[PDB]
Symmetry: D2
Subunit: 292 residues, 4 copies
Amino acid sequence: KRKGIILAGGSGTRLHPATLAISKQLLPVYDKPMIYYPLSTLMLAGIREILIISTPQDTPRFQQLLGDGSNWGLDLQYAVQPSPDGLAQAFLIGESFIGNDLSALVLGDNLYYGHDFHELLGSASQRQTGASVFAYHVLDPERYGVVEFDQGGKAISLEEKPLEPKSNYAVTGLYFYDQQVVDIARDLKPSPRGELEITDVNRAYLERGQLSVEIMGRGYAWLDTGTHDSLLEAGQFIATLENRQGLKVACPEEIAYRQKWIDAAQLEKLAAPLAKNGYGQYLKRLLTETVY
Amino acid sequence: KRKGIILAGGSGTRLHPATLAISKQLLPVYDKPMIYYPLSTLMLAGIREILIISTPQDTPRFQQLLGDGSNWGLDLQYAVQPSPDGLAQAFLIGESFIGNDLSALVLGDNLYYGHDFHELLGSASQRQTGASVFAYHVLDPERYGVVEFDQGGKAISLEEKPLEPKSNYAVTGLYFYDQQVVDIARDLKPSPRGELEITDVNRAYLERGQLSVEIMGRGYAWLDTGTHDSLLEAGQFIATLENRQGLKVACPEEIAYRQKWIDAAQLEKLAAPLAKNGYGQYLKRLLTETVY
Amino acid sequence: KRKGIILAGGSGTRLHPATLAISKQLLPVYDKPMIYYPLSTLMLAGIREILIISTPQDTPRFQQLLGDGSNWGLDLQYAVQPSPDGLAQAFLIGESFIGNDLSALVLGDNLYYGHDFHELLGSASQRQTGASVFAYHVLDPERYGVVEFDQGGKAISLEEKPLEPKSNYAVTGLYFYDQQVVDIARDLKPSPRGELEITDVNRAYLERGQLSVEIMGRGYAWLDTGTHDSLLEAGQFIATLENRQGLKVACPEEIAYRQKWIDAAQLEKLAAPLAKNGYGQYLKRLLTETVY
Amino acid sequence: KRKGIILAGGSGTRLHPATLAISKQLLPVYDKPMIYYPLSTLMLAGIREILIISTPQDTPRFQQLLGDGSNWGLDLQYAVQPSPDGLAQAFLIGESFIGNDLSALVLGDNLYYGHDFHELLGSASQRQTGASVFAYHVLDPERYGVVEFDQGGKAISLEEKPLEPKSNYAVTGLYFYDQQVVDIARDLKPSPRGELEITDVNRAYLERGQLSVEIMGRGYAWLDTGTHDSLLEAGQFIATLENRQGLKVACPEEIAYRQKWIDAAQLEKLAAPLAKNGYGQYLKRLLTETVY
Ligand SMILES: Cc1cn([C@H]2C[C@H](O)[C@@H](COP(=O)(O)OP(=O)(O)OP(=O)(O)O)O2)c(=O)[nH]c1=O
Ligand SMILES: Cc1cn([C@H]2C[C@H](O)[C@@H](COP(=O)(O)OP(=O)(O)OP(=O)(O)O)O2)c(=O)[nH]c1=O
Ligand SMILES: Cc1cn([C@H]2C[C@H](O)[C@@H](COP(=O)(O)OP(=O)(O)OP(=O)(O)O)O2)c(=O)[nH]c1=O
Ligand SMILES: Cc1cn([C@H]2C[C@H](O)[C@@H](COP(=O)(O)OP(=O)(O)OP(=O)(O)O)O2)c(=O)[nH]c1=O
Ligand SMILES: Cc1cn([C@H]2C[C@H](O)[C@@H](COP(=O)(O)OP(=O)(O)OP(=O)(O)O)O2)c(=O)[nH]c1=O
Ligand SMILES: Cc1cn([C@H]2C[C@H](O)[C@@H](COP(=O)(O)OP(=O)(O)OP(=O)(O)O)O2)c(=O)[nH]c1=O
Ligand SMILES: Cc1cn([C@H]2C[C@H](O)[C@@H](COP(=O)(O)OP(=O)(O)OP(=O)(O)O)O2)c(=O)[nH]c1=O
Ligand SMILES: Cc1cn([C@H]2C[C@H](O)[C@@H](COP(=O)(O)OP(=O)(O)OP(=O)(O)O)O2)c(=O)[nH]c1=O
């Protein structure tokens, strides 16, 4: 039984002034609010019960957008992070939400895509012990937590935004944890940067030999909407896929309906209000087309 | 003395579900909120006193983003449009704001760009009588108010969203009016579509021989953020200009400063809070570079 | 042992006038000539011996570009298609090249991408019987060979460019064949459309119960560079992947090297002449980085 | 009467390996060969007699593409530049083509666009003395000839690819010359970079107080297809304009027709062969639509 968390706060600065207008996680990536992406990521890892964290000012807005999740077969809840003091805070704010369950954390501005993605998630959701994260080759490792491998391919060290990255593998923003995480996070101290760093959390598991690091191959897409350029590219990336396939990426209604969290009647009923536009039309069409 | 209006309402359905979390006019075009564009359009027509109209729920968010305009040497005010019942409603809603002055209306999801644009504006701002609009050759005239010319090149008729457009010239979303507009708009009746149509307003002036229709040539760009694709193209269009020139489009602080609505000290001060990101850096650089 | 064919002729009227002077398959997708893509596809299916077919005027060009393939561990050969009379003609023109081997055909303007793409290719290249093709869900099935499935998910019909597609699954431009293909192609007659249609070849296998149709899921990317727009989208799609990952797509040197068809010293030598620019620099970097 | 030159050689290494296969000036920018762009620029400056320079191997291909120009009312000629030894060589290779006339040089991978661009060209093309060039604010002045102004906005120095640019204004690749240029070019000596530099030409005119430097404002688009990314951006830029307006950029047939260098019947005849695709359809449509 795994609970999930979407960390969808932050200040947004790289994007000023676009995001003085709205939290980054409410902006669209092509055709739908950014947060739908990571939401669909948890959903495809089979997690139905999820906690959305954001700023004090934006939390109501996410609530207004997503409601309690029942319409999608989900159980959504909300909490505020008073200040963007680090990804690890997720576990402190989310302590009572998690209780004694397995958990998973995804960053609100991270967008995943690829064939068999859901089998990659599945394998991590199902380890009931230790922690799991994913390594992805990128151009600018210095912008992330970087993971170093020995010649045998084993992970041996982790560094957060190193001036001299030891490899080009970044740890992406998707993390699976067992019941140690809360206590690990309680005992962290701010880093030099002054954050409670998820990298320290991951280092703790590593130092116990309990961190599993799976490679996410060049074949998947792992984009982040951190900068005006990357936001734009992810936008074009999605549009290209959607207009070629006639299938839509990270549309929660669809995923719900394919996982059987809602039935045909429910989907029909999600469609109606949205029927005048292409999104609703797409939802309806799913009721009459078999998609492998 | 011309007052201006930005009609930034609408239900924004073609963009669902992207616009469920919020109003189209708050989304970014590349690097700044959409409404900056039209705002900078009025600003370049030399208009400093401006009414912003939006839905009741979005109104407060515009305010939050633009304040009263004093920091940019503007005088901004706000009004609500309870429902999107037609672009002509702007003149009803805006009646008291206008008083007895000349006025100008720009749609909040309209984006203009081009050499000598501001001379084009100037020439219309300065007619003190009649109305002025602009015609632009487009691919899909049927989506707009279309204007027909006789072989002499004179405008002779206007139709809104005609099934059989009589030409490929659309009237864009930028309108200049003298003091007859409020009364013209008070005597309108909803069209078959059920809107109080700016096209009817324009026809009234045309039937009196007082509508001026200038061509906005192929050289200018007139883009609309109406659909997910066009929104995306507008974003890429701006980013291309900005990254080639190192100059920014529709950055109100800059415009204010160049028009002398604020001085160097003010601009420095606007920069500070935005200094950690590129936008601030750009503002600062304007204090030490001469840009012709 | 399977032999491969890249059909890289056509007239490309859809790209006129861009292709008046030269063949579609020599224009770039972002950073490399188009034909590198499908070449890399055959290479990842483990095919090293390949026949490239083009128009009489462009074949020399391809020769000048790719040479005999030795530098990349390949064995490239060339043949002319005097007129674009159908994709099946690949099997006539290529008869003697094929001899008595298994073969594969890939269209020169098709571009694939995705995780585990190389396992999908492997499975098909190893059948030693019948034929294999791939179905991909697309927006405009009417532009391709379309395959209908029964409720059991079993392929039951195929039509080329139907006005009323029976499904949204298009057969893509990648085909694997056993030793029956040449005789099937010999007995074809021109279609109403005036072509010797691969779709008829595929139907012939289907009629004997020997056509295997695997789904290529929404997780993979299948783009076609047929139109100005799609060619442009394909270019942006590749750049996004390449600028995020720091890895390059369909770079034959790399693939050769990773398959061990050339060694480090050969790669090194392929890099030198290209060292002044990014592509060579990339080839070098591969000698000193481990990429999972 | 001014004669024009398009310098369309180079090795375009920055584009390898895409340009191993085709000169950079033959690759498409969206929907037409790159060279159509600068060709159209000279055409808009009223120049009908034009010399196209390229590498020994690509010249033939340009010939094949453009012919002698008679079909478009132009008089095209060709010459080879044995090696890319500097833009100024244009004037040595073009000496006899030039004779005793005014001349103009445009770089083959330069693309201009903007309202009143044709008036800007006209002004310069009509000076009958001295030289005229254009300064355009850009992000990376260090990659071009850079021009410095004094506080009175008067040009006072020019440097080619300076490590420490004295301003952000690049001299673009469009140059107008009186009868002094050939002699100025004959006395140049190779620069440290080993090129006969047009910047030296321009400086020679500056030292004599006869170089006119006009600003090309942020309102115009000045793009260069020098890198894979910039090529891609230019493509997306043109497509956005073309799909919004239903007009095409730099289509020589149209330009020829609008300038009356060919008549309706000729245009009709250029369209036939191209009638099956959009580009011919567009040429036809111009015979029945008035475009302001
Ligand atoms: C640091 C942090 C990030 N987040 C979220 C926001 C982002 O989606 C994601 C990563 O944020 P970042 O990528 O670290 O960037 P940021 O949102 O802090 O703003 P900036 O670009 O100015 O650096 O995690 C939180 O929710 N709380 C936090 O304390
Ligand atoms: C009609 C209308 C438009 N607008 C704004 C919204 C748009 O920016 C612009 C044009 O509106 P439209 O784009 O014509 O329609 P819309 O904005 O409701 O969007 P959609 O049709 O997809 O639902 O003017 C108002 O602010 N109030 C209005 O009554
Ligand atoms: C006429 C024409 C222009 N262009 C380009 C040239 C210019 O960069 C740009 C602008 O045309 P210009 O005539 O320079 O400017 P414009 O057409 O907007 O101005 P107006 O309508 O008031 O006369 O379009 C073409 O690409 N093809 C053409 O046929
Ligand atoms: C029909 C045909 C195609 N081809 C290649 C060309 C393409 O890469 C691919 C598909 O061709 P098409 O995509 O069918 O397009 P085309 O190249 O025939 O030209 P047009 O756009 O004007 O229709 O197959 C051949 O090599 N020989 C042929 O006879
Ligand atoms: C290896 C390699 C693959 N590709 C392509 C082939 C595929 O479409 C795609 C993905 O490679 P695949 O090997 O299909 O998938 P992957 O690399 O993610 O698999 P793995 O988990 O084992 O690491 O990238 C290249 O373009 N160049 C290459 O060198
Ligand atoms: C099923 C589904 C997938 N996705 C995303 C998740 C995946 O990253 C990506 C790929 O779909 P997957 O089902 O993960 O892979 P696939 O569908 O290609 O595999 P197959 O077709 O053979 O079953 O698409 C959605 O966005 N929405 C959906 O409804
Ligand atoms: C230097 C030179 C350029 N050209 C053309 C090519 C270009 O369009 C334009 C400018 O060339 P450049 O942009 O200076 O560079 P290049 O084209 O040689 O390519 P690269 O730098 O990547 O190797 O001038 C010539 O035709 N002859 C020349 O001698
Ligand atoms: C001055 C300025 C203009 N713009 C916009 C308005 C116009 O659409 C476009 C061009 O402005 P204009 O000043 O009209 O065009 P220009 O600068 O090319 O004219 P010139 O140099 O000959 O004086 O750029 C901004 O976006 N920000 C600004 O600060």
